[model samples]
Target: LEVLFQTKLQLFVKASEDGESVGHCPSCQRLFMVLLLKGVPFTLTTVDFAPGSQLPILLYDSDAKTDTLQIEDFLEETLGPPDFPSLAPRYRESNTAGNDVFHKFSAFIKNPVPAQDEALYQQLLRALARLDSYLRAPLEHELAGEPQLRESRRRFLDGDRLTLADCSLLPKLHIVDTVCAHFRQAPIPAELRGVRRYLDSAMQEKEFKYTCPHSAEILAAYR
Candidate 1:
């Protein structure tokens, strides 16, 4: 339960009224908030990315430094695997897909000129669209989870109480909600019915809700 050690670090992030793909930065924000809710001690801060500076960099504990790796290995030693079963695979797949989505999202927003390559853009958009579908779709939506991901979610949430994936998703899902709002012309819809149900259930949790109040606000916006 005692995760972080005695070390203070500031979190820098892309600051914006709308945190879309980079909004996962808030997911990181929310995750730290969860540590606080759980009574883990730490100081927190945030930096915005709109005007464009540098991103929040990870600060590893001095004790953790090694020749091969300098990154803070929170997942392995502290949080460990997500509570969800098969989460390893789901995370590997979702994150891989999500990274591609984020890249496209970044290019679409950041680049002075839209990627001239039509097929690459199509591929990127498709990946993002698929992720959008998974979050909103329900039991019937084939791409949402299928038997395996569902099994993973059930095991992760029901069996372990809660895990990293749930926390990771909280901020990400909220971002999804925002993206749908801001980009009215190219509005990305999170139209999966079951996802709404899932989001509802997750929001009811005090821990998750407290960590990410914006989540409830996002839900309210759609209604």
Candidate 2:
């Protein structure tokens, strides 16, 4: 939701809230939370992406007297975050490497909802174990704890003021928190204390918090 709206600077969202299986997917439900965090106004359509794909409509036409219209290419071309990066340069430089690496990384984890795919479930657990080990590893191969992980994580957080990367990473961290006991568990080192701090700080920011509100019940359930 954040990526999609942030990408377009849209102030609204349209999605299915139908009780049918159409609105039952975790991925779709997750988008609602993201949209809320993004502070975008949204309306639930009974329509689901069953027989076809569902897309949001941005209503910008005043003459049309409709603050409701399906989003089209024009909205995408005209709106988005000011800091959105250009793909042409990255692609031309052969930075396509990031694409493959990201794909492989994703391949390891099953869908966020383990039940959605058995193979994905196995992949996710295995990846989690590997990440846990990395998070627990130390410098010079010492039996030291996850200092490196902590440092790397913190460094990334401190250096960048939130971006698509941060948004993308947030959901995964949330998933990790879901699978594990706590957000700050021992097995998973807290690499970027600064990032962690920023995350805590973001709670105070209307833009961030509004988009991703605090949910005690959800946290408790995950824990």
Candidate 3:
């Protein structure tokens, strides 16, 4: 099934700062992650900016149509729900949180006004705390019922398999980590153990890991 569309989908992502195929925009990263997660063949068309060549746009050669629609909507139409069935309820929630965090942090990075910067920092901390609790909630429940599940449990937000929720949250979390390291010049918070653990696991996944922009590129973009 994935092979059929190997030549059909084209994604417009931001050009790399150093000519790599990675994207700088968080939305572009989201689309890139979804394509990798779905195991589909898609073209990565990198551009700086243009009238219709904006980053994060999707085009379908099969239908000869151009879509700048919501990433989730595009993915659902292209790949279907079965690809991430377990993520139905949490998809919207995770995406909303990711958007909030991404916008606030990006704004602060672009303009480091003292009042706005401090507010963004506090918001980011709260967001990370919320995500930490949410990620661990399922594990806590499983541990209470069957302690054995602790050793072999799904660590992702939606479950064992990568889902839309993960595709949405992972890139946002990456941005958060990048921003924190630049501003604070510290390691990831010890309190964000769950986030750190989840990221470690995510970094091990070939599709997720390889599709992401390099840390240098991300840092350069923010700077």
Q: What CA root-mean-square deviation does each model show from the true structure?
A: 8.8, 10.4, 4.6
Q: Pick the candidate with the highest lDDT.
A: 3
Q: Which scores better on lDDT, 2 or 3?
A: 3
* Candidate 2 segments whose C-alpha is farther than 4 A from its true place: 1-51, 55-158, 182-206, 213-223
* lDDT-best of 1 and 2: 1
Give TM-scores for every candidate, taking all chains together and pairing residue i with residue i: 0.47, 0.36, 0.76
lDDT of 1 by residue, 139-209 (tens): 23333547445422332222224444455554555455455446434444335343454556666766656
Off by over 4 Å in 3: 1-6, 48-53, 62-71, 81-99, 107-111, 115-119, 139-153
**Pairs in steric clash, model 1:** 14-49, 15-48, 15-49, 83-156, 84-156, 136-192, 137-192
lDDT of 3 at 213: 79
Better of 2 and 3 by TM-score: 3
lDDT of 3: 0.65
User: Candidate 3's residue-wise lDDT over 162-186, tens digit each?
Assistant: 7666777788778778767776674
Predicted model with the maximum TM-score? 3
- Residue 219 displacement in candidate 3 (angstroms): 1.4
Please give the TM-score that candidate 2 achieves against the real structure.
Answer: 0.36
